[PDB]
Design a protein around this ligand. Sequence first.
Ligand SMILES: *[C@@H]1O[C@H](CO)[C@@H](O)[C@H](O)[C@H]1NC(C)=O
Ligand SMILES: *[C@@H]1O[C@H](CO)[C@@H](O)[C@H](O)[C@H]1NC(C)=O
Length: 170
Amino acid sequence: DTITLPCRPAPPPHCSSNITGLILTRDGGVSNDETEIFRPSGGDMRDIARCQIAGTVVSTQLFLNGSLAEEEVVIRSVDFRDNAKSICVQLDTSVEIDCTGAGHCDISRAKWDNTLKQIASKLREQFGDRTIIFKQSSGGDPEFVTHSFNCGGEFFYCDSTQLFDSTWFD
Ligand SMILES: *[C@@H]1O[C@H](CO)[C@@H](O)[C@H](O)[C@H]1NC(C)=O
Ligand SMILES: *[C@@H]1O[C@H](CO)[C@@H](O)[C@H](O)[C@H]1NC(C)=O
């Protein structure tokens, strides 16, 4: 099985990338459900220091191409206790996005799931034994809410509401 994310306009095949990390923002679990909600960020991915892992392509939410870890998912922040501070996520293996040109870029469901199992068990190291909920960016504009990227001089905007709709370790 495969996660089919629609994008506008129809991304060319050469815009296939590797996901090598992502910026998350805890809202975070503010007055108790024994949970933590995390959402992908809509902010500039260079407006977050101590996450100097981006290569060349301009994006939001995830890092297309760019730097990987030595061989364990590494999650960092300037202060996890402050929810205004974004969380840097750097992978160890990259999940490939295959843009076929029709209108959607595709992700192996199995690859994502286990990239999510590792992130959540890393977040669970920092914050402890609590439910890690992955959810959609909660707005701002039609830009913010999507995974946007630059490829061939143009911006493509992908409905990323599928990658972030999970709960781990209830
Ligand atoms: C993505 O994944 C691996 C990372 O080592 C790389 O060897 C491969 O060439 C990359 N392919 C694409 C399409 O990004
Ligand atoms: C990322 O790297 C691959 C392999 O070099 C490249 O072909 C692809 O176009 C890059 N992705 C983007 C969005 O430019």
